[PDB]
Each structure stands twice: as C-alpha cells, then as structure tokens.
C-alpha cells in the first residue's frame, strides 16, 4: 500500500489487474489479536429430565453383521444398487 501512485499504476499495467484492491499482504483488515471472552453453546443432551443414556446409546445400538448365506447350515436379476446417473454439465460455466 505504501507504493507511490506511479508505481501502483505500473504494476497494474504490467499485470493488467487492480492489484491495489486485492493486495497480497495483510495490513489491518485482520481480526485483532485480542477478542472478548467467548461463551460456548452446550450440547443437545445437556438436560435435567428424560435424558437417560440408554435411549441415546451410541454404541450398544450396534449389532453383529447379518448373515445372508452360510455353508455351515423365478427371481429377477438384482444389481448391487441402482445404476449411477449421468452428471449434468455445469451450467454456471460448462466450458473453461
């Protein structure tokens, strides 16, 4: 920013940009190093009623794998899942 007016124009002309508007170095727009103390929000399970852990059990709701065919003990052909769709060309800017 300290650059003189003559130099400011030159490096815009050579690069063909408004370099002054978008400078590479931070001067003051950054946040100040000190900020007022925060006050963080609490989680959705912070309650004093009807909040037993057994209902929101993260892990015990998991179960072992299910077994489809086990050797120890007219149907339509089935794919592993629906076939992928065809992506649509980006209409914001389809071509570079």
């Amino acid at each position: 920013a300290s650059a003189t007016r003559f130099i400011q124009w030159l490096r815009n002309w050579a690069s063909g940009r408004d370099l002054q508007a978008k400078l590479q170095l931070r001067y003051q727009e950054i946040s100040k190093r000190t900020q007022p103390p925060p006050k963080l929000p609490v989680g959705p399970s912070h309650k004093l009623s009807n909040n037993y852990y057994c209902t929101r059990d993260g892990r015990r709701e998991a179960m072992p794998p299910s077994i489809v065919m086990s050797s120890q003990k007219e149907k339509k052909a089935v794919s592993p899942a629906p076939p992928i769709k065809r992506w649509e060309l980006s209409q914001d800017e389809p071509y570079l």
């Binding site: 920013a1 300290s2 170095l25 931070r26 001067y27 003051q28 950054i30 100040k32 190093r33 000190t34």
Partner: protein, 48 residues
C-alpha cells in the same frame, strides 16, 4: 511498533548491547526476549 506496515513487520525489538555478562552488541539471538514481552512481540496479544 508501527501499525502502518503489513502484519508481521509492525512489532520489532532492538537488542541491548550487553546482557547477563554477554557482549550482545552483535551476537543477538531470539532467546534474549524476556517472557513478558514475548507474548506481545509474537503478536499473541494486543496490549503491551
């Protein structure tokens, strides 16, 4: 200090020529900064 330079070059320290018996007129090293000024010097806080 000079807040009219870009971030990083706006807070610099000039080192004494002597300290703790060492002739630091030349052999200046970053560890000579006392802890209190370290927080301000490294831009960890605003108030000196």
């Amino acid at each position: 200090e000079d807040n009219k330079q870009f971030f990083g070059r706006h807070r610099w320290v000039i080192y004494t020529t002597e300290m703790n018996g060492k002739n630091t007129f030349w052999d200046v090293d970053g560890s000579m900064v006392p802890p209190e000024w370290h927080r301000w010097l490294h831009c960890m806080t605003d108030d000196p």
